[PDB]
Structures are given as structure tokens and as C-alpha cells.
């Protein structure tokens, strides 16, 4: 169903008395998980829903952006620094940050100008996101449409609802996976694809527990 | 000492007449009037936070006892390949695995993945039952169910129930504080809690935390 | 519509439209002209209201009150701290013989056997015991803050944030209610700047490892040469 009282929930069969009264099956991804009660106020709930969805979309883009260059890296492209948690240090290289390895594509040399342009454009677009602008004077803060649907996938309300659920769930998956990227880059020091390759090489010995005694103080 | 109502003991003592919020009526155990951050203004969030407090408290009491006990038993004679608590998990990677009390014949655990798998299975089952009930309860209280969890029957009187609630939550807050201390001072010191106490008792004035104060300075 | 000298900002005591930019509906907001729908609970009645509650944490008015008090107290402590993390280093580069003027190392001065001379002068405070220092401090600050939260020898029936009797407004700068209202904004804005800059002190310590004025100096030496991106690869996972 994914909506209403008979919806899928976070603990499955053991979830009848584990859902609060305020988590009516109205909003996408409502599996009934508010054990901490942080969304008891409807306004805080709305703000947290916006944070969830924006984090979700950004995390989907980032998951794809951390997976793609590494795949393309072994698939035959050079990628001076393919691993994602050092892809930013390419600016300090000899030839700068060449996009696909092509010295002719971007050839970025200064990180401060890159950052300046980024703050410029990102502030403009996020302020347009909060209060509108050239792409939406008065739309929904989360699902504006009408210029962010050039394909028109969600003109039916039922398709709209199911795609909302699909969106938020792929996004929660990506947020979990991006948290994993972070922790296991810090722990392992290698890329995600190389971590998968190493896990597939010897699943029983080079899992995370091989890196468990890494952060022990030991005087 | 009352522990309830308006004339209850409070977390700033005499200093506490006008700091307590209007919503912290002396109804619930451990209500000393400490919500300076206002995080429990909504009664529902307050209920959820009370559940989190009590569960953290119980888990922290068990964990405090579980970090103190093996070390005591360690110097009191018993073999403990790794007695210190923040390396008690790395026994699985030793030659003979994790022997419980040092006895090679007790448990002799060798694989951490299987240990973890059983743990997730039964912990999920138990915590789901805790949330919505099961073989040991259908519609009981989420925090103080009783029945199967009072085989001794200590809390059938409401007044004894209340005072034991306060005792529970206070021993638990003490244990949570002490477990936070275990964490920070294991990270800082790198030794066990009992050895930290022994070192503090050997030279209290120059074996305290301030001896490890310049430990985390960046220094370029 | 006005004359030249009123445009130029003359004639103090003409202030009732100057509170309009810091209180009320059409005030300055956190994204300026790109922040349309301010939270309804941020009505513009409190100082520093720029409409910033993206996370909706202050939706309850009572927790909003508690958060306001947290903000102002953090702001005052951070202002004192931002001034105190730069005063010793400035005074040391001007020539006062402070033995460790860097702030994140200033606490380790008490373990040198010459003690913690205040301005590097042994005739001054000359503290040797960090434990006695901490005990004195705990007693005094406990009394002080318990007096703050309910009342004490310096006024009991006063406001929790701006008591303003003869002990905490002894210069009478805030007897004019409009001056008070704009000084509240000045307080909270300088304090938010100080909190941000103290977060910056913390991060510049953990990252750079030098003093904040040393960081300013090495940035002013060659800014594009030396920046925070200079230390971007420092936390490389190995
Ligand atoms: C009945 C069986 C059942 C059980 C036990 C669970 C359990 C869970 N589901 Mg659920 N589900 C179940 C059925 C179903 N789920 C779902 C759909 C979902 C969704 C969409 C989601 C969940 C999520 C969750 C988790 C929420 C609680 C949590 O965050 O964990 C807290 C408890 C732990 C983290 C314990 C960790 C175990 C392990 C021992 C940790 C190891 C300890 C470390 C070594 C210590 C750390 C070291 C430090 C010092 C660095 C939880 C694991 C959520 C989730 O994935 O969050 C993670 C979530 O988003 N479920 C469906 C479809 C209808 C089900 C159908 O039956
Ligand atoms: C009138 C005297 C009196 C005073 C001053 C206090 C004060 C306190 N009581 Mg309280 N009580 C008092 C009487 C009583 N209490 C209680 C029962 C309780 C309980 C049950 C509890 C308290 C707690 C507290 C604390 C809550 C405030 C806080 O969290 O500090 C926050 C401020 C700080 C922590 C600042 C640090 C102080 C110190 C100088 C730290 C040193 C600085 C470090 C070097 C910094 C480290 C550097 C890092 C960043 C690298 C506080 C210490 C609570 C508690 O223990 O929480 C901690 C608590 O649970 N009291 C009773 C019985 C009725 C009293 C009887 O009169
Ligand atoms: C009795 C001695 C007493 C002492 C030594 C202090 C000392 C202090 N109070 Mg304090 N208070 C005292 C009683 C009281 N205070 C307060 C309410 C406050 C507030 C609301 C604040 C202070 C702050 C301060 C600090 C800044 C003083 C200042 O503004 O300088 C000007 C002269 C300082 C540590 C400030 C602080 O801690 O910020 C860092 C702060 O915001 N006090 C009340 C309730 C009206 C008191 C009642 O007796
Ligand atoms: C920052 C990201 C983020 C945010 C803001 C939210 C916010 C929300 N989620 Mg989502 N969620 C997320 C990530 C996030 N989630 C991820 C990654 C997963 C997969 C594990 C889920 C899975 C999930 C389910 C399955 C459900 C929700 C639900 C909710 C709502 C109620 C709970 C709440 O108030 O949490 C507030 C959250 C925070 C204050 C973030 C705190 C983060 C701290 C640091 C802990 C995180 C570390 C971890 C170890 C709320 C709108 C429930 C709902 O009603 O759906 C609409 C629901 O059923 N979420
Ligand atoms: C669905 C997401 C996802 C996927 C597919 C993987 C997959 C992998 N992770 Mg990552 N990881 C994730 C989420 C994920 N992780 C998250 C959320 C965290 C933070 C808790 C981590 C933290 C983490 C660390 C610290 C390490 C790995 C490692 C690994 C690899 C070995 C497996 C292992 O040790 O398990 C560890 C798994 C976890 C700690 C938690 C994930 C929970 C799973 C998804 C649920 C249980 C399912 C079972 C089948 C493997 C490629 C290790 C590696 O690089 O080996 C080569 C390693 O060192 N991961
Ligand atoms: C009641 C709980 C409890 C107990 C009994 C102890 C006991 C001890 N701790 Mg632990 N600790 C605790 C909580 C506790 N700690 C918590 C909550 C933290 C996190 C802030 C720490 C963090 C910590 C570190 C980082 C270190 C210790 C160390 C020590 C030992 C030396 C004492 C010291 O340096 O004081 C430090 C105490 C604190 C930092 C905070 C505890 C607050 C106490 C309980 C309240 C004050 C009571 C005190 C008697 C009154 C003093 C008044 C005045 C002098 C201030 C000693 C065995 C040191 C060690 O291993 O030496 C061998 C050490 O390096 N502890
Ligand atoms: C720039 C920062 C700033 C500003 C504009 C204000 C503004 C105000 N405060 Mg706040 N306050 C601040 C910082 C600030 N305060 C800090 C850091 C503390 C903690 C020490 C306090 C503690 C405090 C209390 C306890 C009270 C006020 C009160 C007031 C009001 C009247 C006093 C006044 O106009 O001061 C104007 C400020 C200046 C002209 C700045 C002077 C610069 C100093 C002297 C620099 C040197 C600092 C010194 C060495 C550090 C030792 C202390 C007004 C709203 C009172 C009030 O509202 O009652 C009606 C009140 O009760 N404030
Ligand atoms: C907080 C504590 C505040 C009180 C501190 C008292 C210090 C006691 C002491 O031992 O002093 C000892 C000190 C002298 O001590 C000398 O200090 C010097 C630096 O000042 C040097 O370090 C010398 O080495 C040291 O001998 O005595 C005095 O300074 C008191 C004289 C007061 C003169 C100022 C009067 C003006 C007052 C009116 C203006 C304000 C209204
Ligand atoms: C629900 C609930 C319930 C109860 O009640 C309470 C609680 C528990 C609290 C809750 C929970 C929550 C949670 C879990 C959360 C989580 C979150 C996350 C994980 C996020 C992520 C998130 C994530 C994210 C954003 C991500 C992002 C990403 C990105 C941007 C990326 C970027 C990039 C890339 C591409 C790579 C390159 O080279 C560079 C960079 C630049 C790096
Ligand atoms: C009240 C208030 C008020 C205002 O308003 C606001 C505020 C301030 C926020 C608040 C406060 C709060 C607080 C303080 C909190 C704290 C917490 C804690 C400390 C916890 C712990 C907690 C803790 C805990 C759980 C603990 C636990 C433990 C455990 C499990 C253990 C385990 C173990 C052991 C045995 C050992 C071995 O070898 C292993 C292991 C495995 C390791
Ligand atoms: C608004 C909003 C909105 C949405 O809705 C949500 C959110 C986002 C959450 C929000 C935000 C928030 C924030 C941003 C916060 C921040 C904070 C801070 C930064 C603080 C600091 C804070 C800071 C502070 C206190 C500071 C303090 C300081 C001090 C005491 C100092 C002391 C000292 C000194 C002098 C020096 C010496 O030698 C040493 C020491 C001892 C070191």
C-alpha cells in the first residue's frame, strides 16, 4: 500500500504499537520510525521531511558521483585521482583537474575561483529553491514540477505518489550507502569499488572486522 | 525526601525554584527539573525521550558491570587473554578465540561474523518484542512491563514501585555518566577503568586527567 | 522626499523606523530577498530574528525560549572567548613576555614549574595548582550560574537574559527602550559572529595547529599561496 494505516512499517509485523499517533500514512516513506519522537510537531515534521528529501537527492547524486569515476577508472580511463575522497586534491596536481583525464576539457587550476563560482551559483539556486524564482514563483518546496518535469512523469496523483515513495526510498538507500562510503573510507582508506573487489576476493577475512582494532587507543 | 510533586529534589538544589519548566511536573521518576535546553516541551517527545533515557540507563548499567567485572576477576587470579574492555572484542582474532573465563572448554568462539549474525537475529527479535510485545507480553507498559520481568515481585505496591523507579533511573544515570567516562578516559588514557583507579590511588595529585591534557594538541 | 542632512544620518533620537530593519515583518532575513516563507513563530519580536529555522527546531515556543537563552549565553561566552584567544597573542607579538600566548596551549602553562604567570610576570597571579584553580573556579561559577538561573545578591526579580539592575547595567546604556532594542540586536549579532569565529578558532586549531593570529599573518603573507585548502589533504585517510 505504502499509505494509510495498513502501510509497510519499519519493524514489519512487530510494528502495530511502535508507531506514533502523528505518523499517519500521509507522507512518502512513512514506515512509522520516530522512536525518538523528533517529529511530534507537524511543523518540525515538515521541516525534517524537507531535510530528508534534500539530503536524499544530494546523496543519490553523490553516490552516483563516487561510483562512476572509479568504474570508468578501471574500465580504461586514467583518472589522475579516481578515488572520490581524493578527487578534490587534483587541483594541486601539475595539470590541474582534468575532467575525464582530458587535458583539453576543463583544466582547472585554481580552487578558490572554482569555489567562488560554486558559492555564487549554489546560493542563487538554493535561495530560488526556498522562495522561488525564474523556475517557479509559487510551487511546492519539495515537488515543484512545471520546469523540473520536462518529461512529465507525475501528472497522475497515483503515479506521483508511488514515484514519491520510490524517490525517498532510493534516497534513503543512497544516504545509508553514502554514510557507509564515509565511514569505510575513513576506516579502510580505499575506494568503494575497491572495497567491494576486496570483499569479493575473500569475503570472510577482509570484511570490516579486519579493521576493527584500528582505532584502539593503546596508551 | 519526596522525589515527586512540586517539592521534589531538583538538579540545582536551592537554586532551582525558577529554572524548572512548567511541563516538568513531578510525575515521572528522576524529574529533577533539568530541561534547560527545552528538548522535552512536547509531551510525546518527552515520553520518547524518557524511554530512551531508561533504555540507555539499563544498557549502561549492564555495560558498566560488564566492563568492571572482567578486570576485577583478572587481577583476582583468573586468566583473561584480554581483560581490558575496549580490547575484549579483539579476542576472536587470537589463536584460541574468545574463551569466556579463560576456559578453553567454555565457549571457544572463533568466528565474529557468526557471533554477530546470531546477535542481530535475537536482538532484533527481542527489541521488536520490546516495542510491540510478544511471547512475554501483549499490551504492557513500554518501559515497566512486569509479569515475566518480575519473577521476584518487588514492585506490586505503587509506592515501592515509585521509589524503585527512582532508584533504577538514578543508578542508571550514574552508570551512563560512568560509561561516558569509561569511553573518554579509555580514549585519553588507553588503559582500563580499574587500572585508572589504581593509578589515581597511587598518586592522586599527578595521576589525574590533567596529566593527559596536552595529548590532543595539534601542534602543526 | 527628505533633505540632504537627514539622508546623511544626522539627528539622533529619530529612531522608530530604524528598528524596522531588525524587528517586525519587513526586516532583514537570512537569505535576504531569497527567503520568502519565514516560520510563523519567528514573528520578528526577538532580537536577531532573521527567519532562520530551516531545521524547525524552535517550533515549540517554550523550547524556542530555551534556545534563545542558550544562544545568548553561548554568544556572551564566545565573545569573551574570542577576545581572550587573541588578546594574549596580540600582546605577545607587541612584546609582552607571555610564555604561551596561543590559546589552545595557554592551559599547559600551569604545568611549568614557574607557574602560570598572568602576563608573563611572576609577581602576578603565579598559579601552580591546576586542581586548586579548578576548585576555586567550580565553586565560584556554580554560585554564579545558580544565581543567574533564579536570582541572587545582584537582583532576583529580574529578566533571565537582561537583568539590567545596577550590577549588570551600571552604565545605564539600556534605559532608552529603543536603544535597548537595538543594543540587543548588536549584542546578538556580535555574539553570533563570535560564536562563528570561535568555531573557526577550534577548527583552525584542529586543522592548522598554529595560533589564530599566526594563521592571519601567514594568510596575509601570501593568501592564495596559503589557505585552508593548503591543509585540505591533511586528514587524508591513509
Ligand atoms: C521483523 C523483523 C525486522 C527487524 C528486526 C527489523 C529491524 C530494523 N529495520 Mg526493518 N526490520 C524488520 C522488518 C522489516 N523492516 C522493513 C523495512 C525497513 C526500512 C525502510 C528501514 C528499516 C529499518 C530497520 C532498523 C531500524 C532500527 C535501527 O535503526 O537499528 C538500530 C540497532 C542497531 C544499529 C544495532 C546494530 C547491530 C550490530 C550489533 C551493530 C554492531 C555494533 C558495533 C560493533 C558497535 C559500534 C562500534 C563503535 C564504538 C564505533 C532495524 C534494524 C531502518 C534502517 O535500515 O535503519 C538502520 C529503515 O530505514 N526496516 C520491512 C518492509 C515492510 C520489514 C518486513 O518485515
Ligand atoms: C547548590 C549547589 C549545586 C550546584 C552548583 C549544582 C550543579 C549541578 N548539578 Mg546538582 N547542583 C547543586 C546541588 C544539588 N544537585 C543535586 C542533584 C543533581 C542531579 C541528579 C544532577 C545534578 C546535576 C548538576 C549539574 C547540572 C549543570 C551542568 O550540567 O553543568 C554544565 C557545565 C559544565 C559541565 C561546565 C564544566 C564545569 C567544569 C569547570 C569543567 C572543567 C572544564 C574542562 C577542563 C573543559 C574540557 C576541555 C575540553 C573542551 C577539551 C551541575 C554541575 C546533573 C549532572 O550531574 O550533570 C553533569 C545531574 O544529573 N544535580 C542535589 C540533590 C537534590 C543537590 C542538593 O543541593
Ligand atoms: C553575586 C555575584 C555574581 C557574579 C560575580 C556574577 C558574574 C557574572 N555574571 Mg551574573 N553574576 C552574579 C550574580 C548574578 N548574575 C545573574 C544573571 C546573569 C546573566 C543573565 C549573565 C550573567 C553573566 C555573568 C558574567 C558577566 C558579568 C557581567 O555582565 O559584567 C558586567 C558588569 C559574570 C561571570 C553573563 C555571562 O555569564 O555571559 C558570559 C550573563 O549573560 N549573570 C543574576 C540574576 C539576575 C545574578 C543574581 O545574583
Ligand atoms: C538527515 C537525513 C534524514 C532526515 C532529516 C530524516 C528525517 C525523517 N525521517 Mg528518514 N531516513 C534517513 C535519513 C533522514 N531521515 C535514512 C538515511 C534512512 C535509512 C536508514 C531513513 C529511513 C526512514 C524511515 C524508514 C522512516 C523515516 C522517517 C523520518 C521522519 C521522522 C523521523 C525524524 O524526525 O528524524 C529526524 C532526523 C534527524 C534529526 C537526523 C538526525 C541524524 C543523527 C545524526 C543520527 C544519524 C546517524 C545514524 C547512525 C523524518 C521526516 C519516518 C517517517 O515518518 O517517514 C516520513 C519513517 O518511517 N526515515
Ligand atoms: C547497503 C550498503 C552497504 C553495502 C553494500 C556495504 C558493503 C561493504 N562494506 Mg560498508 N558500510 C555501510 C553500508 C554498506 N556497506 C554503512 C552504512 C556503514 C556504516 C556503519 C558501513 C561501514 C563499513 C566499514 C567500516 C567497512 C565496510 C566494509 C564493507 C565491505 C565488506 C562488508 C563488511 O565488512 O560489512 C560491514 C557492514 C557494516 C558495518 C554495516 C552495513 C549494514 C548492512 C548493509 C546490513 C547487513 C546486511 C548483511 C548482508 C562491503 C563491500 C568493510 C570493507 O571495506 O571491506 C572491504 C569496512 O571496513 N563498511
Ligand atoms: C563518577 C564517575 C567517575 C569516576 C569515579 C571517575 C574517576 C576517575 N577518572 Mg573519569 N571521567 C568521568 C567520570 C568519572 N571518572 C566522566 C564522566 C568523564 C568524561 C568527562 C571522565 C573523563 C576522564 C578522563 C579523560 C580521565 C579520567 C580519569 C579519572 C581518574 C582520575 C581522576 C581525574 O582525572 O578526574 C577527571 C574527572 C573528570 C574529567 C570528570 C568527572 C567529574 C566528577 C565525577 C565530578 C567531580 C567530583 C570531584 C571529586 C570534585 C572535584 C572538585 C574540584 C577539584 C573540581 C579517576 C579514577 C583520568 C585517569 O585515567 O587518571 C588515571 C583521565 O585521564 N576520567
Ligand atoms: C558587543 C557586545 C555586546 C553588546 C552590544 C551588548 C549589549 C547589551 N548588553 Mg550584553 N553582554 C555581552 C556583550 C554585549 N552586550 C557580553 C560579552 C557579556 C558577558 C560579559 C554580556 C552580559 C550582559 C548582561 C549580564 C547584561 C547585558 C546587558 C546589555 C545591554 C546594556 C549594556 C550595553 O549596551 O552594552 C554595550 C556594549 C558595549 C558598549 C561594548 C563594550 C566593550 C567592552 C568594554 C570591551 C572589553 C571587554 C572586557 C575587557 C571583558 C571583561 C568583561 C545591551 C542590550 C544588560 C541588559 O540588557 O540589561 C538591561 C545586562 O543585564 N549584557
Ligand atoms: C580578582 C582579585 C582582585 C583583587 C586583587 C588584589 C591583589 C592583592 C595583592 O597581592 O596585590 C599586590 C599588588 C602589588 O604586587 C606587585 O604587582 C605588580 C604588578 O601590578 C608586579 O607584578 C610586582 O611584581 C608585584 O610586587 O598590590 C597592588 O597592586 C594594590 C595597589 C592598588 C593600586 C590601584 C589603586 C586604584 C584603585 C582605584 C581605581 C579603581 C576604582
Ligand atoms: C529516521 C529516524 C528516526 C528516529 O526517530 C530518529 C533518528 C534515528 C535520528 C532518525 C534517523 C536518521 C538517520 C539514520 C539519518 C541518516 C542520515 C544520513 C545517513 C545522511 C546521509 C547523507 C549523505 C549525503 C547528503 C551525501 C552527499 C554526497 C555528496 C554531496 C557527494 C559529493 C561528492 C562526490 C560525489 C564525490 C566527489 O569526489 C566529491 C564530493 C564533493 C564528496
Ligand atoms: C538531561 C539533559 C537536560 C538538558 O535539557 C539537555 C541535555 C543537556 C542534552 C540533557 C543531558 C543529557 C545527557 C547528559 C546525556 C548523557 C547520555 C549518556 C552519558 C549516555 C551513556 C550511555 C551509555 C551506555 C548506553 C553504555 C552502554 C554500555 C554497553 C552496551 C557495554 C557494552 C560492552 C561492554 C560491557 C564491555 C565489553 O568489553 C564490550 C562492550 C560491547 C563495549
Ligand atoms: C540557527 C540555526 C538554524 C537551523 O534551523 C538549525 C541550525 C542550523 C542548527 C541552527 C544553527 C546553529 C548554529 C550554526 C550554531 C553554532 C553554534 C556555535 C558556533 C557555537 C560556538 C560557541 C563558542 C563558544 C561558547 C566559545 C567559548 C569560548 C570560551 C569559553 C573561551 C575560553 C578560553 C579562552 C578565552 C582561551 C583560553 O586560553 C582557553 C579557553 C578556555 C579556550
Coordinates of N, CA and C and ligand atoms in Angstrom, one line a residue, chain C residues 72-78 80 140-141 143-164 167-170 187, ligand 3:
Chain C
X72 N 22.0 33.2 23.6 CA 22.6 34.5 24.1 C 23.7 34.1 25.1
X73 N 23.6 33.1 25.9 CA 24.7 32.8 26.8 C 25.9 32.3 26.1
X74 N 25.7 31.4 25.1 CA 26.8 30.9 24.3 C 27.4 32.1 23.6
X75 N 26.6 33.1 23.2 CA 27.1 34.3 22.5 C 28.0 35.1 23.4
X76 N 27.6 35.3 24.6 CA 28.4 36.1 25.5 C 29.7 35.4 25.9
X77 N 29.6 34.1 26.2 CA 30.8 33.3 26.5 C 31.7 33.3 25.3
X78 N 31.2 33.2 24.1 CA 32.0 33.2 22.9 C 32.6 34.5 22.6
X80 N 33.6 36.8 25.0 CA 34.7 36.8 25.9 C 35.8 35.9 25.4
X140 N 33.0 29.1 42.4 CA 32.6 30.5 42.1 C 31.6 30.4 40.9
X141 N 31.8 29.6 39.9 CA 31.0 29.6 38.8 C 29.7 28.9 39.1
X143 N 28.1 29.0 42.1 CA 27.4 30.1 42.8 C 26.9 31.1 41.7
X144 N 27.7 31.4 40.8 CA 27.4 32.5 39.8 C 26.3 32.1 38.9
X145 N 26.3 30.9 38.4 CA 25.3 30.4 37.5 C 24.0 30.0 38.1
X146 N 24.1 29.5 39.4 CA 22.8 29.3 40.1 C 22.2 30.6 40.5
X147 N 23.0 31.7 40.7 CA 22.4 33.0 40.9 C 21.8 33.5 39.6
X148 N 22.4 33.1 38.4 CA 21.9 33.5 37.1 C 20.6 32.9 36.8
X149 N 20.4 31.7 37.2 CA 19.2 31.0 36.7 C 17.9 31.3 37.5
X150 N 18.1 31.7 38.8 CA 16.9 32.0 39.6 C 17.0 33.4 40.2
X151 N 18.2 33.9 40.5 CA 18.3 35.1 41.3 C 19.4 35.0 42.4
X152 N 19.8 36.1 42.8 CA 20.9 36.2 43.8 C 21.1 37.5 44.4
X153 N 22.3 37.8 44.9 CA 22.6 39.1 45.6 C 22.5 40.2 44.6
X154 N 22.6 40.0 43.3 CA 22.5 41.1 42.3 C 21.2 41.2 41.7
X155 N 20.1 40.9 42.4 CA 18.8 41.0 41.8 C 18.1 39.7 41.5
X156 N 16.9 39.5 42.1 CA 16.2 38.2 41.9 C 15.0 38.3 41.0
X157 N 14.3 39.4 41.0 CA 13.1 39.5 40.2 C 13.4 40.2 38.8
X158 N 14.6 39.8 38.3 CA 15.0 40.4 37.0 C 14.9 39.4 35.9
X159 N 15.0 39.9 34.7 CA 15.0 39.1 33.5 C 16.1 38.1 33.5
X160 N 15.8 36.9 32.8 CA 16.8 35.8 32.8 C 17.9 36.0 31.9
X161 N 17.8 37.0 30.9 CA 18.8 37.2 30.0 C 19.4 38.6 30.1
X162 N 18.6 39.6 30.4 CA 18.9 41.0 30.5 C 18.5 41.5 31.8
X163 N 19.1 41.2 32.9 CA 18.7 41.6 34.3 C 18.7 43.1 34.4
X164 N 19.8 43.7 34.1 CA 19.9 45.2 34.0 C 19.5 46.0 35.2
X167 N 23.9 46.2 38.8 CA 25.1 45.4 38.8 C 25.4 45.0 37.4
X168 N 24.5 44.8 36.5 CA 24.7 44.3 35.1 C 24.3 45.4 34.1
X169 N 23.8 46.5 34.4 CA 23.7 47.7 33.6 C 24.1 48.9 34.4
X170 N 25.3 48.9 34.9 CA 25.7 50.0 35.8 C 26.1 51.3 35.1
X187 N 24.2 43.1 20.4 CA 24.7 42.0 21.2 C 24.6 40.7 20.5
Ligands
LIG3 C1 26.6 37.6 43.1 C2 27.6 37.6 42.2 C3 27.5 37.5 40.7 C4 28.8 37.4 39.9 C5 30.2 37.5 40.4 C6 28.3 37.3 38.6 C7 29.2 37.2 37.5 C8 28.9 37.1 36.2 N1 27.6 37.0 35.7 MG1 25.9 37.0 36.7 N2 26.9 37.2 38.5 C9 26.4 37.3 39.7 C10 25.0 37.3 40.1 C11 24.0 37.2 39.1 N3 24.1 37.1 37.8 C12 22.9 37.0 37.2 C13 22.5 36.9 35.8 C14 23.5 36.8 34.8 C15 23.2 36.7 33.4 C16 21.8 36.6 32.8 C17 24.5 36.7 32.8 C18 25.4 36.8 33.8 C19 26.8 36.8 33.3 C20 27.8 37.0 34.4 C21 29.2 37.2 34.0 C22 29.4 38.6 33.3 C23 29.3 39.7 34.3 C24 28.9 41.0 33.5 O1 27.9 41.0 32.8 O2 29.8 42.1 33.6 C25 29.2 43.4 33.5 C26 29.4 44.2 34.8 C27 30.0 37.1 35.3 C28 30.7 35.8 35.3 C29 26.8 36.7 31.9 C30 27.5 35.5 31.4 O3 27.8 34.6 32.1 O4 27.9 35.5 30.0 C31 29.3 35.1 29.7 C32 25.4 36.7 31.5 O5 24.7 36.6 30.4 N4 24.8 36.9 35.0 C33 21.8 37.1 38.3 C34 20.4 37.0 38.1 C35 19.9 38.4 37.8 C36 22.6 37.2 39.5 C37 21.9 37.3 40.8 O6 22.6 37.4 41.8

